[PDB]
Design a protein around this ligand. Structure first.
Ligand SMILES: CC(=O)N[C@@H]1[C@@H](O[C@@H]2OC(C(=O)O)=C[C@H](O)[C@H]2O)[C@H](O)[C@@H](CO)O[C@H]1O
Ligand code: NA
Length: 754
């Protein structure tokens, strides 16, 4: 293959990144996309350094700061995009083209060339500039000289001689993985189009294959659908999306050509759309629990990331078999239609507009998010849904870091892996509306927390430390899940807590036991810390209302349930005091991200919490959350033993859901919770239907060869469904012994006959 094929490939990439082939005559969304393109282009043009012998290309961007070097190149590729887009203000503009060509020439001369050593963030030299510079070569291919091509290719090959590797030589080069591998290969593949280099192209293409091979440790896609980047952080929602975006674009680019991605194992990547990406998408937004440090970004939010995921999945769908195509389109139509908070077409590029328009043209109906549980034990994350809500739990353990901070981002996020309970609801802005600028990072919802102030970046950057805890894990049987976390506090306070969650189809029961610390400070547990935006939502009790005055914390009393207007109900499952605070909070995104704006955002919060006090000895909590519940239903939560606590202490935690006829339990020690028993760390959910007992079990340390339960509900003589060896103990009770060797926290489902 040759010059004909290379021109065809370049043209297809220009088509893809401009949408020049798919702008619809008189369409108002295509019109607003062009206007956004125009404004960005004009902004950049306004900031050009017009000076003779200039030392920068843009007056607000220093070439001696690598992030602003990257920004210089992305402004240039944006301007070339606009120059290439029919009906853009600068389309085919000779003067604009001139300024682009000079910008790329001077950026090369002054800074980014084959004689330059990397300084600062390697990502800028090897991914930031190459992708942008490659796009600009290809966009401007009819206009750049052979000598210009040579110099910019040379610069690129200098920083990235092999996209299977990363880091400047002075550092020791390592295997690039995951999002990094994709971005590296992208810059080289696009560069290979500009330079017509089939050798670098084939090698870059070959290198996508490693990203979708399953892994059992470190970075990549796990069999349970977890995605980790940077070893210790659940990262489906941001690095996952960068991967997904890059592969969508490259697969589509190369499909049908001599360079087509032909590896059959890529079906693992296709399976990940529903196995990894869809469960953590909530009405358009990637879950905060899976997007690591990006929560600190005012303008790279859950919706930004979920919209990018939508674009990519729509792009990929074009190439799939008919059933899979339609399913993925149905999922996307759903995430689009339910999102009236950040509609995808607001600020969409021309290509994203085209894919969303295309989707709408198929008429494919929106698929709803399925109720129930999706567990990701490899990354300490679980998802739970019912009518009106999606709960996302965020854990940490000897495998998963408390948090990632880096590059001045998320330095305060050290409690975000302390058992957070994100309840996503029709309040689509709950976590997006300056929540991470204004929230109390020491009372994040759900967490147990030692009130010792911690320094920014405590435990270090880049998730380099993990809590040395006993286990975190989960299992589920039908409508009921069991999740548990041994919380070890960050910042060496010696905080320790045993947190468990038992999630049905509507209610979530939260139990805590065995809470102590070495620090001498008070320890709290946060029933909720809910963004009210500018609202004065009522907090309704048996007595009447509580916490009417902002800033004056009040203590519930003996009705034991509280209802928050527009959210749902909360209810105490013990006689602990409930502290309720209405507060007004302020902060700027500059306060949580070194790139954040200084604008001060001000938000009202409801904060609900238990105080375990100074020096708790076996401190404990017991409460439940009922998202979407009316006052009538909230009042009734505690009536009729509907949620019947069985055990809550340092050995076991367990509840029975009276109506679901299902019992759930976590086990920290050899022991019994009512008539269920276990011989070692376990999550279990069981239900008897007549003469049959269904159980779901996991071995949550991920290290034990086996596990023995002591069966509830009488004796059991045969196994109807699944693995395990029956038996009788010393006391005439039935046992089930499992081989849990290598299960990696996964659930085993079993059925037994009396
Ligand atoms: C996933 C992540 O945090 N990556 C960082 C970069 O962020 C991303 O920008 C892109 C992209 O440029 O293709 C995709 C995402 O929307 C966004 O998260 C970030 O710009 C660089 C800055 O050095 O660091 C990466 O680690
Ligand atoms: Na890490």
């Amino acid at each position: 293959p040759g010059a004909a094929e290379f021109a065809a490939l370049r043209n297809r990439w220009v088509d893809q990144i401009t949408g020049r082939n798919v702008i619809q005559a008189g369409d108002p969304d295509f019109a607003k996309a062009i206007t956004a393109l125009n404004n960005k282009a004009a902004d950049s043009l306004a900031k050009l350094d017009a000076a003779a012998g200039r030392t920068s290309v843009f007056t607000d961007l220093s070439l001696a700061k690598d992030a602003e070097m990257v920004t210089t190149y992305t402004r240039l590729s944006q301007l070339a995009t606009a120059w290439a887009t029919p009906t853009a203000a600068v389309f085919g503009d000779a003067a604009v083209l001139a300024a682009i060509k000079a910008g790329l020439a001077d950026a090369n001369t002054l800074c980014y060339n084959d004689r330059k050593e990397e300084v600062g963030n390697w990502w800028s030299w090897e991914i930031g500039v190459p992708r942008a510079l490659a796009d600009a070569m290809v966009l401007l291919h009819a206009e750049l000289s052979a000598a210009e091509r040579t110099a910019y290719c040379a610069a690129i090959d200098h920083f990235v001689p092999d996209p299977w590797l990363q880091f400047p030589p002075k550092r020791g080069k390592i295997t690039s993985v995951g999002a990094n591998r994709v971005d590296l290969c992208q810059g080289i593949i696009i560069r290979s189009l500009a330079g017509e280099d089939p050798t670098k192209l084939n090698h870059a293409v070959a290198g996508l294959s490693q990203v979708w091979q399953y892994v059992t440790s470190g970075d990549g896609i796990f069999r349970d659908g977890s995605f980790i980047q940077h070893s210790t952080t659940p990262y489906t929602g941001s690095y996952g999306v960068v991967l997904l975006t890059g592969l969508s674009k490259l697969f589509s680019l190369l499909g049908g050509t001599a360079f087509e991605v032909s590896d059959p194992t890529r079906s693992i990547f296709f399976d990940a759309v529903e196995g990894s990406f869809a469960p953590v998408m909530i009405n358009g937004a990637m879950a905060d629990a899976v997007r690591g440090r990006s929560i600190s970004r005012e303008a790279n939010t859950g919706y930004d990331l979920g919209a990018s995921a939508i674009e990519a999945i729509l792009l990929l769908a074009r190439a799939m078999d008919p059933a899979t195509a339609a399913r993925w389109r149905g999922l996307c139509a759903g995430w689009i239609a339910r999102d009236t908070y950040r509609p995808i077409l607001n600020s969409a590029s021309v290509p994203r507009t085209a894919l969303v328009k295309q989707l709408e043209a198929t008429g494919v109906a929106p698929v709803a998010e399925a109720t129930g549980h999706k567990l990701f034990p490899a990354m300490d994350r679980t998802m739970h849904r019912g009518p009106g809500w999606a709960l996302s739990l965020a854990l940490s353990s000897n495998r998963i870091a408390w948090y990632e901070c880096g590059n001045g981002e998320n330095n305060r996020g050290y409690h975000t892996g302390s058992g957070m309970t994100y309840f996503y609801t029709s309040d689509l802005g709950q976590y997006d509306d300056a929540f991470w600028a204004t929230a109390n990072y020491n009372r994040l919802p759900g967490i147990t927390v030692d009130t010792t102030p911690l320094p920014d970046k405590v435990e270090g950057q880049w998730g380099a430390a993990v809590p040395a805890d006993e286990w975190s894990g989960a299992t589920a049987l039908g409508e009921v899940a069991a999740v548990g976390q041994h919380l070890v506090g960050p910042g060496r306070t010696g905080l320790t807590a045993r947190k468990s969650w038992f999630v049905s189809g509507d209610v979530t029961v939260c139990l805590g036991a065995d809470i102590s610390t070495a620090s001498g400070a008070k320890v709290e547990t946060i029933v909720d810390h809910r963004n009210l935006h500018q609202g004065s939502n009522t907090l309704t009790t048996a007595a009447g209302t509580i916490a009417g005055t902002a800033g004056t914390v009040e203590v519930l009393g003996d009705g034991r349930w509280v209802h928050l207007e527009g959210f749902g109900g909360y209810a105490m499952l013990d006689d602990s005091p409930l502290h309720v605070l209405r507060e007004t909070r302020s902060g700027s995104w500059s306060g949580v991200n070194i790139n954040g704006s200084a604008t001060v955002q001000q938000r009202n919060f409801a904060t609900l919490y238990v105080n375990h006090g100074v020096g708790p000895v076996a401190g404990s909590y017991a409460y439940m959350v009922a998202p979407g519940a009316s006052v009538d239903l909230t009042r009734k939560l505690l009536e009729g033993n509907k949620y019947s606590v069985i055990r809550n202490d340092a050995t076991a935690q367990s509840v029975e859901f009276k109506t679901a006829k299902t019992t759930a339990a976590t086990f920290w020690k050899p022991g019994m919770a009512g008539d269920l028993g276990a011989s070692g760390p376990a999550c279990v959910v069981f239900s008897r239907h007549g003469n049959e007992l269904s159980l779901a079990v996991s071995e949550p340390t991920q290290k034990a060869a086996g596990l023995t339960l002591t069966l509830p509900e009488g004796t059991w003589s045969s196994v109807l469904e699944g693995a395990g060896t029956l038996g009788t103990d010393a006391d005439g009770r039935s046992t089930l012994t499992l081989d849990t060797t290598g299960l990696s926290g996964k659930t085993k489902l079993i059925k037994l006959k009396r």
